[PDB]
Amino acid sequence: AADIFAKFKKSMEVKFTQEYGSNKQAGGDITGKTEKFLRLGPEQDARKQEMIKAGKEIAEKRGIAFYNPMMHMGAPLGQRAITPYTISGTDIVAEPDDLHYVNNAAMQQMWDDIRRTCIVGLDMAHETLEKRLGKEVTPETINHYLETLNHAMPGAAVVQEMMVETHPALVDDCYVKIFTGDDELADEIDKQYVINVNKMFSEEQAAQIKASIGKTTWQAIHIPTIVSRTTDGAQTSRWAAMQIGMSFISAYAMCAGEAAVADLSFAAKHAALVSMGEMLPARRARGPNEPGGLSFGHLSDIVQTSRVSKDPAKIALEVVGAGCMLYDQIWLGSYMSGGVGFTQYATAAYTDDILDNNTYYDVDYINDKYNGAANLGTDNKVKATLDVVKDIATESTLYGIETYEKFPTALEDHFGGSQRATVLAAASGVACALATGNANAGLSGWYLSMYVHKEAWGRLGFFGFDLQDQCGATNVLSYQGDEGLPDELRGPNYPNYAMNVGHQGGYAGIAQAAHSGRGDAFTVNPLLKVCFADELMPFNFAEPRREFGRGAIREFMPAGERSLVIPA
Amino acid sequence: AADIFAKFKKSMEVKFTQEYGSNKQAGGDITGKTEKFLRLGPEQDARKQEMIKAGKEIAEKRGIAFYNPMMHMGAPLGQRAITPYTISGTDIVAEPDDLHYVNNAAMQQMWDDIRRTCIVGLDMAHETLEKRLGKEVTPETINHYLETLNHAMPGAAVVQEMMVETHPALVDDCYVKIFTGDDELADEIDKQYVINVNKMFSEEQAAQIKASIGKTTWQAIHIPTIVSRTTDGAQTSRWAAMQIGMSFISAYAMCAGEAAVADLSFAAKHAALVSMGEMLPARRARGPNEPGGLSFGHLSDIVQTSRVSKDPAKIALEVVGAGCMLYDQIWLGSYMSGGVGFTQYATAAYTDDILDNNTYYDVDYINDKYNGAANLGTDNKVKATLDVVKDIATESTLYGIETYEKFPTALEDHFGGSQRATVLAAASGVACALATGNANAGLSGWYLSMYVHKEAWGRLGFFGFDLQDQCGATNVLSYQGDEGLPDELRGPNYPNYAMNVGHQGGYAGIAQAAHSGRGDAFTVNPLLKVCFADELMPFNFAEPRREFGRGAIREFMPAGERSLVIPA
Amino acid sequence: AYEAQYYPGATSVGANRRKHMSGKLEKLREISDEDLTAVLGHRAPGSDYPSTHPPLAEMGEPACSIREAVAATPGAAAGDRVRYVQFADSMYNAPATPYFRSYFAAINFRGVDPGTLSGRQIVEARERDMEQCAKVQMETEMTDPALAGMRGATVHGHSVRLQEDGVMFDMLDRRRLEGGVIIMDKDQVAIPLDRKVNLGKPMSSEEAAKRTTIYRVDNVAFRDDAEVIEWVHRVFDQRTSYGFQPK
Amino acid sequence: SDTVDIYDDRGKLLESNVDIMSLAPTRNAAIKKIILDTKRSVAVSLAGIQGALASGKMGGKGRQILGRGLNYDLVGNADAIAENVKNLVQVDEGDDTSVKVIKGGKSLLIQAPSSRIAAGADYMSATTVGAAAVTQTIIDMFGTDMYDAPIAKSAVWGSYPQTMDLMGGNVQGVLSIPQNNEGLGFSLRNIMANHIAAITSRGAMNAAALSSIYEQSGIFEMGGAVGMFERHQLLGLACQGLNANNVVYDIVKENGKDGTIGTVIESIVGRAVEDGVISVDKTAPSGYKFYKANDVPMWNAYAAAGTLAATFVNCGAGRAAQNVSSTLLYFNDILEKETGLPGCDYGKVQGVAVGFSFFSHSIYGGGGPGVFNGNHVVTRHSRGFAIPCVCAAVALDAGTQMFTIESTSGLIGDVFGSIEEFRQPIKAVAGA
Amino acid sequence: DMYDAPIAKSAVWGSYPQTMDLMGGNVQGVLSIPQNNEGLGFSLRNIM
Numbered sequence A, B: 001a002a003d004i005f006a007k008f009k010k011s012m013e014v015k016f017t018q019e020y021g022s023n024k025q026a027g028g029d030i031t032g033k034t035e036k037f038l039r040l041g042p043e044q045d046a047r048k049q050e051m052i053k054a055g056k057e058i059a060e061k062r063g064i065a066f067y068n069p070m071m072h073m074g075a076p077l078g079q080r081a082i083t084p085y086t087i088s089g090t091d092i093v094a095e096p097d098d099l100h101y102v103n104n105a106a107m108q109q110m111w112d113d114i115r116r117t118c119i120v121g122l123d124m125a126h127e128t129l130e131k132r133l134g135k136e137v138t139p140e141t142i143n144h145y146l147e148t149l150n151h152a153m154p155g156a157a158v159v160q161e162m163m164v165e166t167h168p169a170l171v172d173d174c175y176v177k178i179f180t181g182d183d184e185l186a187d188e189i190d191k192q193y194v195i196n197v198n199k200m201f202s203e204e205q206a207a208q209i210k211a212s213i214g215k216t217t218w219q220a221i222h223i224p225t226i227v228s229r230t231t232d233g234a235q236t237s238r239w240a241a242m243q244i245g246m247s248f249i250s251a252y253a254m255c256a257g258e259a260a261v262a263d264l265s266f267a268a269k270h271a272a273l274v275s276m277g278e279m280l281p282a283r284r285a286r287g288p289n290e291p292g293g294l295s296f297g298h299l300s301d302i303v304q305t306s307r308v309s310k311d312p313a314k315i316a317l318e319v320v321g322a323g324c325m326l327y328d329q330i331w332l333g334s335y336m337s338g339g340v341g342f343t344q345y346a347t348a349a350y351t352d353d354i355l356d357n358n359t360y361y362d363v364d365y366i367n368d369k370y371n372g373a374a375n376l377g378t379d380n381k382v383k384a385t386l387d388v389v390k391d392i393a394t395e396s397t398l399y400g401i402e403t404y405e406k407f408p409t410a411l412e413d414h415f416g417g418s419q420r421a422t423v424l425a426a427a428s429g430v431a432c433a434l435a436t437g438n439a440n441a442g443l444s445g446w447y448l449s450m451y452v453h454k455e456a457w458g459r460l461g462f463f464g465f466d467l468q469d470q471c472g473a474t475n476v477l478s479y480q481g482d483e484g485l486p487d488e489l490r491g492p493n494y495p496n497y498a499m500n501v502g503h504q505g506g507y508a509g510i511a512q513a514a515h516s517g518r519g520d521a522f523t524v525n526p527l528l529k530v531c532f533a534d535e536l537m538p539f540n541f542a543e544p545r546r547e548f549g550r551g552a553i554r555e556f557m558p559a560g561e562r563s564l565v566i567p568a
Numbered sequence C: 001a002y003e004a005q006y007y008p009g010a011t012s013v014g015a016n017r018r019k020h021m022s023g024k025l026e027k028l029r030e031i032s033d034e035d036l037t038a039v040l041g042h043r044a045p046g047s048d049y050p051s052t053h054p055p056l057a058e059m060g061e062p063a064c065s066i067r068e069a070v071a072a073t074p075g076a077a078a079g080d081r082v083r084y085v086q087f088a089d090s091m092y093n094a095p096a097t098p099y100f101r102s103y104f105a106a107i108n109f110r111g112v113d114p115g116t117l118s119g120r121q122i123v124e125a126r127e128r129d130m131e132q133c134a135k136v137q138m139e140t141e142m143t144d145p146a147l148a149g150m151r152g153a154t155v156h157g158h159s160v161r162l163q164e165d166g167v168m169f170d171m172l173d174r175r176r177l178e179g180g181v182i183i184m185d186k187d188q189v190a191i192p193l194d195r196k197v198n199l200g201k202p203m204s205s206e207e208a209a210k211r212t213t214i215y216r217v218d219n220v221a222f223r224d225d226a227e228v229i230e231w232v233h234r235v236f237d238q239r240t241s242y243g244f245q246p247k
Numbered sequence D: 001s002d003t004v005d006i007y008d009d010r011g012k013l014l015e016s017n018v019d020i021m022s023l024a025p026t027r028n029a030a031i032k033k034i035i036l037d038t039k040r041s042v043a044v045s046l047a048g049i050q051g052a053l054a055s056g057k058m059g060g061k062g063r064q065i066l067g068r069g070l071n072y073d074l075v076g077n078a079d080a081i082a083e084n085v086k087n088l089v090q091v092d093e094g095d096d097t098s099v100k101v102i103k104g105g106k107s108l109l110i111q112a113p114s115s116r117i118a119a120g121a122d123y124m125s126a127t128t129v130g131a132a133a134v135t136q137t138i139i140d141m142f143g144t145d146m147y148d149a150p151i152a153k154s155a156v157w158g159s160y161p162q163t164m165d166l167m168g169g170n171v172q173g174v175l176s177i178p179q180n181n182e183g184l185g186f187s188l189r190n191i192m193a194n195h196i197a198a199i200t201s202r203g204a205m206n207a208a209a210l211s212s213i214y215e216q217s218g219i220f221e222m223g224g225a226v227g228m229f230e231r232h233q234l235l236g237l238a239c240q241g242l243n244a245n246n247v248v249y250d251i252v253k254e255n256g257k258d259g260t261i262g263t264v265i266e267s268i269v270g271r272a273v274e275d276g277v278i279s280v281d282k283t284a285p286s287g288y289k290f291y292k293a294n295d296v297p298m299w300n301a302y303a304a305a306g307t308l309a310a311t312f313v314n315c316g317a318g319r320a321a322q323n324v325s326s327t328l329l330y331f332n333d334i335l336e337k338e339t340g341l342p343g344c345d346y347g348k349v350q351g352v353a354v355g356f357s358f359f360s361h362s363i364y365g366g367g368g369p370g371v372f373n374g375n376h377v378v379t380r381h382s383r384g385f386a387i388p389c390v391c392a393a394v395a396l397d398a399g400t401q402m403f404t405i406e407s408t409s410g411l412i413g414d415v416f417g418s419i420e421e422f423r424q425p426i427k428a429v430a431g432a
Numbered sequence E: 001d002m003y004d005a006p007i008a009k010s011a012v013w014g015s016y017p018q019t020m021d022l023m024g025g026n027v028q029g030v031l032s033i034p035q036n037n038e039g040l041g042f043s044l045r046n047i048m
């Protein structure tokens, strides 16, 4: 697309040909092959200057050494110009350091919003009440329950005398809404508690969700961020169940602790629970609701772009961005390692419009070659074959490589081979998935991209990068026990994927792409799709990339801060 | 002890005979058996009033129901007077609600300080350098290494060009110190980095510690609270290792990534790592450095009272307090459940001096009857027998029960049977451990207390309280595979202990008591003892109960807030 | 035939505990079927028992030698819901203590699900079986209507100082002294009734002291009951020793 | 070297003068066979795979992959499937592989040959080879193109290997995955009570017996039956699980009409006195008699027997599973009060029952009795003497539960309930 | 002595069952504990 290409060139112009801080990069040509290295060091960058000053001040105050760029071997950072990033699809121009998750409240809040969320069916609980107690469940009793629940969930008492409670000002982000595939029920629940499927989704998307879940009713529970940050992911479903239990006791005048209550527990904690992700094996031991457990389809469903956009590529790209940030910066870059971590490995996939350029080129290529296959639809899709993948993936990768070659700015932007590989393979995979409506065909294209990349440049990514790459093509359509899996159900714990940056976000985009090409309401789980179709949540799941930008410019307010109970 | 008994009386006077908020509880007798119930509801209490107002305003602003005490069945909280708690051993009078961990930054920070900490040996890494690279390690090279590490550990670059870094002002709580049993080496390391064993401990304790660890050198690593809160405990050792690795590369001019580097990784991540706790099984799946994995011995060693006190009872009581808070309020009451949780289950063991009264009585009884056995010493201890335990535990429990009976205020304070059970058994167990220097004799005493309690009152604790109780006596000296274990090595994952409030903190106290009676330098791990012998840590580990008080009155400053990068 | 001895101890607390366990209890008051149903709050007084499953005779039963040997209760036969009665008892010499209520149920009633807590004790059973159990507890010396209360939720009070009129605190005020008698005008989960249930006069402090199954140092001191302490010590020594080596 | 007579669930003598050491999981051919058969067997829901294939609903709760429908008539072709599956599962023609079509083609029993178990570290080969065989059969029989292979595969395997288990899959045995073990040697303890009652067709004594076999095999594997502990555990297994000397059944019978937990205690104590297992040690001033055991392991076995008989009586009376948690607690609590002797497992049955009561009547976890097992955090603590009672209780429920045997265990019941050594475990152990 | 039984036991078994394994104990084979398995049928693959 000409418009995306123009945006890409503008991003290169801004990054490399207008001065940032005092980097002296005013003027020049985004196609030129040369650069003047001024050896300014870190001070050329406004953020680094602030950091240096804080570091020295804190060191002196606390009495033990701290941040000191002169501790870098040989020379301090910024012997070449330190340049900004534009958040893709936006005019937000960010300090590099402001995109580190530690430094970015929007990124932290995105994870918190996922971590602190679970989904619990209501039907089993209602059946328990009817069967064991002979209670009648009506819209009225549900409304009373939901009001009770909205008091109880943030951490407040409904039954016992002399209870202490969480401070409401600390847990303001906690609430429960319900959603239902039963249109009649939906109309009779107090609107304050309802995620209205018919209002939030197109008529065709609503119809798919309703057909998938039938006439079932579900709670979308978001526990306090402050709690989530004190504890862990595995807390979430436990917290939800406790307060669901108390709310049932209170709202339905049960015995405050009888046999029927245990059925409610079991339902809430197991039989009718939907977690964001499942537990992880011993080497990387973690309970549910951690990033490792979050399947690529689950992430695709959390992200809300599919709901508000008719552009298949855009939907996929938002998922890529959200995925690269979560999976690489927070998951791999912190949970699974730490330190400086992997900001730029991820930013490559959501900044400067480079990925978008490659992807939009592909959409045009596909539409020209395959009779409008990349357009939203189900009849227009092409059957996944090796031939189709070879065609689309090769062409995508050649085009991406050539762009890096014609624009030394782009190559210097994506200075790591890994970054370029993620970008090239993400566009290839997304393109193959868009064309075929087959997520694994997307995976094939991803892997093929890597193979083309490697032969073209005589290099690929970092030392370890292509473990999953080389196992990649062969495991796409394997049906062996620990090899076979649709990409929609794959995730960070899929064996080949368990370790390495620059992939997991791409695979999420590929999962989404197979479905957004088709205009599907969801990628793998309608329950998650509806759960997050809720503007009350702190993080805007419909525009993840933009949200990262808002965080970079310190305009995002997270939940969970403790200033109320802190010295001023 | 007369001073403790008097201090208990004063706590009962403050709580029940002096007005608090608007509760009208001026005047009266602490021994009287009657009360006038004014049915004032929550508004009588100043915190509740503030919570009510915040709840109403937030509900209105966000457009979904929230905190509302009128949702409590029958009647709102405070049909009887809402009365305060005094932190035991202090004059800090706290609002009940201010001791909920969510509402209390000191409690959150105590957990943060532990979660974010690990200990990594240096000897193995030094051998690696010498063997594989033929490097000489000297005090000078270590000093340079530690300066590098204190730059890198918070999340700063030492090797690559064009790196983004954590903002120093967000991660000012992160640092690395060393300690060593090699006195000569200690004298040669820059003092800014050293935990000085000879300065921080008494001569006797320093000698025990040095004899234990020999001439080994260790890094005490505390990663950023902000990171710990974003991720989990399993992050900690990974983060430590990453930055240790980078620092070795930089400080010793290694290849930035060679085979020898992997040896450093294995040593930091595994061979020379000491975690606060180990991983947990599937049902309660969690990685290392979570509360469940934290042995009672470990907690005893983190708490620093043993280092600054020579009163065995005081030392044990501090551990009880720290333990009930962490294990019951955060771990069992949040991680393993959630909601309103278990504040008062825990406060019962660190407020109003009730536990202290019983314990100090026990010390006097023991000293009188067992020739000063409870005084600090090793050869004054009595050999653990059934007779000794029956004597001490029975006496302890009888006295504690009589106190509750003679002071209706105390009974009403510890209104829950479980609370009373923890109190009585803690005293009994600590008492038995103090006399014998045998932690499992402490456990026998704990269980017998429960047995006496149940028969005396025809009640014990909550429905599920005495699962471990009834398994308790028989498993104390079992040597069966999944039964036998010294209390020092027991923890929240010991099978009988894995579920229920009101025990774990007591067991920590009992483990400490066996050692504090002896004047021992540590309970199970000298590495943890020295690691936390460090005033730079936000949480004052020498005085956990007081610290909780400081948090209650909003005087504790936590790490990890994000106000720097948040809208103002 | 083996005759149960129930519990050790020669004090009044001993005699009372043995009375509670054996069900050898003095009837002190009456409650009509309809009044009892009312306070229990599970169905309209006088109404049919709702069911959770069809009667045994209607649906049939799997081939089972135990089902064949063990007679279903009337409540089990009819497929009644499992419902409950729950009580709080003051530590200030209420006749009942939680464990002893549970022992009474387990010893004297078929098909019961007793649960003991500090602040409450419950019996869950098939509705009609449960009622017979609630009736006994309510009409006998086991319950004092001032020092105890039937409470299905918000049970707080057992450990709280008494009101000046000798009534144990109820957050939800389900029962209180009116005209020298205890009136219960709400169900056990504090839903107001269309009736005032007369539970008769409370015990004097003196009488409750003589009738209580609880020990207290200002009444019958546990410290002084060498026989029951011996019981505890014996069980303790056995459990400890046998957990090391069962021999 | 104790000898016992073994009696069936109707009080009929099965075998006289059995040495208890011959009842050891490590010695008894029939128990070994039960264990081997349990390890090597899995159920497959052909109906489930067929549904997942057509709808895309695979991989876990809520999951659906749109636009990837495969319409394969598995149920209509179950015999041919079973035959192909047998060919893949077997190691050698004529080995002990068995594959049976269950419930009109909806389900399969797959018994992997014992060679796979011999060659394996554990039992998961039955699942993995079973799933692999079914996956291969489907792909071959229905002509799945390679671009659809992932969809066919996950219809069988669910979310594995993103998940550690076959979450939202259609292959499962009676055991769970090894990684769910809380302890070492716990795999045979990780069997839902509902499963046990399903497999024994709600025969309460048979449920308790099958459960005792697994539990004690568990204890043995945990190293909890070494030296003096062997006699201890086998006495319990015999007296509680295998109706030794008809005592359990006899006690039930005499307490069946009007008996309570209270009267069952009287039955046990009466016998213990008669049989010389216990005697009065001391009479207290009040006339209360303090007992001592003449044989501690034997007393424990009487308490174990009593605990079960009490379960049969109390749960039996109420036709209500929930009564089991209080039965275990109060049988043992009141027994100690009655005698001054320790209750079953020296407090550990009572211990389990305290937590089990709470976790079967509260907000915090657990559930109805049917969800518990010997590997469950709540009910693991006793050495095999609690969970058999729970399986009995679940068997006896006449329909109070939300989590019925069918809801959790229908497939397992249909498939494993057909196997006679499982359905009739007392007869199996007694060689009848 | 039974009061020292816990010490003798853990000299052998280490921190089990606080830990999932015999951490700091003195009994080991070639294999690892089952729960260390990444996948199904992996125990025999878990040999250093």
Ligand code: F43
Pocket (backbone or CB within 6 Å): A338, A339, A340, A341, A342, A343, A344, A345, A346, A415, A416, A417, A418, A419, A460, A461, A462, A463, B152, B156, B157, B158, B159, B160, B161, B163, B164, B242, B243, B246, B249, B256, B257
């Ligand atoms: C020491 C290693 C070996 C290793 O295991 N990890 C390193 C270490 C470094 C450390 C660097 C922090 C620091 O500078 O102190 C961290 C940040 C991980 C951490 N500990 O936080 C890291 N790499 Ni690496 N590392 C990166 C990259 C790279 C690229 C850089 C090539 C180039 O031309 O600059 C190459 C791999 C390759 O050749 O493809 C690379 C190498 C290597 N990577 C070499 C150092 C290379 C050198 O001597 O300069 N990283 C990248 O390719 C992109 C971004 C990136 C990182 C963080 C971010 O995403 O912002 C990151 C992240």
Ligand code: F43
Pocket (backbone or CB within 6 Å): A156, A157, A158, A159, A160, A161, A163, A164, A242, A243, A246, A249, A256, A257, B338, B339, B340, B341, B342, B343, B344, B345, B346, B415, B416, B417, B418, B419, B460, B461, B462, B463, C117, C118, C119, C120, C152, C153, C154, C155, C156, C157, C158, C159, D361, D362, D363, D364
């Ligand atoms: C619904 C239950 C059943 C269950 O499984 N847990 C409950 C639930 C309640 C809820 C109460 C919140 C609310 O009121 O909405 C919570 C806070 C757990 C949560 N969901 O966060 C809880 N108990 Ni409980 N719960 C407690 C206690 C108790 C004591 C109270 C007896 C009394 O006389 O008041 C008794 C058990 C006993 O008798 O021993 C008890 C019962 C029971 N406990 C009864 C309610 C009893 C009633 O109807 O009043 N709790 C305590 O003994 C002390 C403190 C305490 C809790 C929190 C804190 O520690 O601050 C707590 C904590």
Ligand SMILES: C[C@@H](OP(=O)(O)O)[C@H](NC(=O)CCCCCCS)C(=O)O
Pocket (backbone or CB within 6 Å): A238, A269, B283, B284, B332, B333, B336, B337, B464, B498, B499, B500, B501, D359, D364, D365, D366, D367, D377, D378
């Ligand atoms: C029993 C078990 O729950 P499940 O039976 O697995 O649902 C377990 N919970 C607990 O043990 C809760 C402990 C804290 C709350 C009660 C303390 S008295 C857990 O969540 O893993």
